[PDB]
């Protein structure tokens, strides 16, 4: 009938991956933490990757940098931490002692 008996939290799992795509860094091509905007267009990167390419801006959209100083995004930052939670909710830690 099922691999792990029902399983549940299936639809939620797919939702996590979806939101992750909106947080997945462009350079690290993965989940970031406390990244930086810069991508005035529609791109985003961590706060330790774009710094090595601020002279230009975005490596894809080729858009010029808008922030001279390595600013931070509390919004996107909090989004990452939240996404991490759901990841554990789906995994479910089964352990007593």
């Amino acid at each position: 009938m099922e691999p792990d008996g029902r399983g549940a939290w299936a639809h939620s799992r797919a939702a996590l991956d979806r939101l992750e795509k909106l947080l997945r860094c462009s350079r690290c091509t993965n989940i970031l933490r406390e990244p930086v905007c810069l991508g005035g267009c529609e791109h985003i990167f961590c706060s330790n990757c774009v710094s090595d390419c601020i002279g230009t801006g975005c490596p894809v959209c080729y858009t010029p940098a808008w922030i001279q100083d390595l600013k931070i995004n509390r919004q996107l930052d909090s989004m990452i931490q939240l996404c991490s939670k759901l990841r554990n909710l789906l995994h479910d830690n089964e352990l007593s002692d």
Partner: protein, 103 residues
């Protein structure tokens, strides 16, 4: 069927906190047209019209205190999918668990 209340309260807590990041800093209305303001802040576009329409000169960032002007902000579309996607996440929750989200 509330999914047997098994790890259902935890998820709902993550869905709510998520909406906070994709919320509004002026009218508290789920932003639709995310626009980056001079102060690196997001808005619903229309919110800027009123903030700038007011006879008080350059807009005043209500998030910090001020620092906003007409020829500054621009629809970058960065917090768009984050808002639309999130909405789809809450739908799945009620679809299975069927628990309350917010009122």
């Amino acid at each position: 069927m509330d999914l047997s209340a098994l790890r259902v309260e935890e998820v709902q807590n993550v869905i709510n906190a998520m909406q906070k990041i994709l919320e509004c800093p002026i009218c508290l209305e789920l932003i639709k047209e995310p626009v980056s303001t001079k102060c690196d802040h997001i808005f619903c576009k229309f919110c800027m019209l009123k903030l700038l329409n007011q006879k008080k000169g350059p807009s005043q960032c209500p998030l910090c205190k001020n620092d906003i002007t007409k020829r500054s902000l621009q629809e970058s579309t960065r917090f768009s999918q984050l808002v639309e996607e999130l909405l789809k996440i809450i739908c799945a929750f009620q679809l299975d668990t069927g628990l309350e989200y917010a009122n």
